[PDB]
């Protein structure tokens, strides 16, 4: 009987997550925000063709883009307020009123009611029209300092290519409109005060006034074009998007966890072209971590899908269902033995000089596996009984991994598994295993 084992070779294996998500602002902005959150927190050094990169090479992010991730970080939340008082706005739609009126004992308790949801409902109209030209001024704070020329504009990386002026235009031009009827808004605002203070207050002025402020509000919670709400929110989303089309590729990512050998290596996919971390810390001022740059990465494959695909659901809508693609990549290798009664198959390595150290062992009939320190979380062992052939795959090598790797055979039973040379019966003479960093 006799062990044959067989090297692999390096691959790489690409995997994909399709994540179920929506196109409603309120999830399109908690992505907006993992990628500003990450970036304004934890500025990573930018990488040393852009002017903002001749500058800022070498020097945490923040140095170089403290404005602009600020510009951001409020046109997000500026966004995340109108989303809520639109929600609110839908909460207060006022009701129209028998006319002439038709006195009851309860009336004025029941004006008293539809006069309090005309003024809060008026009121949130105001602050919606308030926060969305907050955003459009710091849309202009976000656009007029390094990303001036390349945000806005349109491998792809340096550019926004996100249609940001498109949207500038429309939020610009719809809020113009909203405020071109402002007049008849305070019209209803000060006939709800005069009605709490208790003709010009017929039940027609009334549904008048109720009338006119559904109007604007079902404009301003369920456009599009027409509506500044959705032109503000869509532009935070927007300018999120460009802002890492035009400087995310300059962050360096891949920083360390705890210990500085570990090298985990991750590509990332866009749509078509890889970003790599790690081929020295992940902390402020210095890198991001892989789980950063995953989430970041995430976040943006789910934004970026949504616009394009469905674009942003109406504020007052729900959103459709859509699947976004997130793909990385890893560097593997697959390790196998061949066999010509089993217990147990193992597989040892020898580094120069060293003695043999176990890695990965399994039972042979049930499959239950048995990890050293070394293979705890980067390697899989399995076996086909049927060929008689036990796996290891390995994940994530490192230089430290460099051995000529044994597998190993035991014919009898156990109660501990084995794990020293003298235990197992069968061996194969080696494959070499180097790995380069």
């Known amino acids: 009987v006799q062990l044959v084992e067989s090297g692999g070779g390096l691959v790489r294996k690409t995997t994909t997550s399709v994540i179920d998500t929506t196109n409603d602002a309120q999830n399109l902005l908690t992505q907006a925000q993992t990628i500003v959150n990450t970036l304004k927190d934890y500025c990573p050094i930018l990488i040393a063709t852009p002017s903002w990169q001749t500058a800022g090479g070498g020097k945490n992010s923040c140095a170089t883009f403290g404005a602009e991730f600020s510009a951001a970080s409020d046109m997000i939340n500026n966004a995340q307020k109108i989303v809520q008082e639109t929600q609110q706005l839908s909460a207060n739609q006022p009701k129209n009123i028998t006319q002439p009126h038709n006195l009851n004992l309860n009336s004025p308790s029941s004006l008293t009611a539809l006069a309090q949801k005309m003024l809060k409902n008026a009121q949130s109209q105001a602050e919606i029209l308030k926060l969305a030209n907050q955003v459009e001024s710091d849309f202009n704070k976000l656009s007029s300092g390094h990303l001036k020329d390349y945000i806005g504009k349109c491998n792809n990386w340096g550019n926004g290519c996100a249609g940001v002026e498109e949207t500038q235009s429309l939020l610009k031009t719809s809020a113009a409109d909203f405020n071109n009827q402002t007049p008849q808004i305070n019209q209803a605002q000060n006939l709800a005060n005069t009605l709490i203070q208790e003709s010009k207050t017929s039940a027609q002025a009334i549904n008048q006034a109720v009338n006119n402020l559904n109007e604007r509000a079902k404009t301003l919670a369920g456009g599009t074009t027409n509506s500044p709400a959705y032109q503000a929110t869509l532009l935070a989303l927007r300018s999120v998007l460009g802002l890492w089309n035009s400087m995310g590729y300059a962050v360096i990512c891949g920083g360390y966890t705890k210990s500085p050998g570990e090298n985990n290596q991750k590509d990332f996919h866009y749509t078509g072209t890889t970003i790599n971390c790690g081929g020295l810390k992940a902390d402020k001022n210095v890198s991001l971590s892989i789980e950063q740059y995953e989430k970041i990465h995430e976040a943006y494959q789910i934004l970026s899908k949504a616009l394009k695909q469905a674009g942003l659901a109406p504020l007052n809508s729900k959103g459709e269902k859509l699947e976004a693609h997130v793909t990385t990549s890893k560097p593997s290798l697959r390790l196998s033995c061949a066999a010509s009664?089993?217990?147990?198959m193992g597989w040892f390595r020898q580094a120069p000089g060293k003695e043999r150290d176990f890695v990965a062992g399994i039972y042979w009939t049930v499959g239950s596996t048995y990890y050293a320190d070394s293979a705890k979380g980067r390697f899989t062992i399995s076996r086909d009984n049927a060929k008689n052939t036990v796996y290891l795959q390995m994940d994530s090598l490192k230089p430290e991994d460099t051995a000529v790797y044994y597998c190993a055979a035991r014919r009898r039973g156990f109660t501990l598994a084995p794990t020293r040379a003298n235990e197992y019966d069968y061996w194969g003479q080696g494959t070499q295993v180097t790995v380069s960093s």
């Open positions: 009664s089993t217990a147990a």
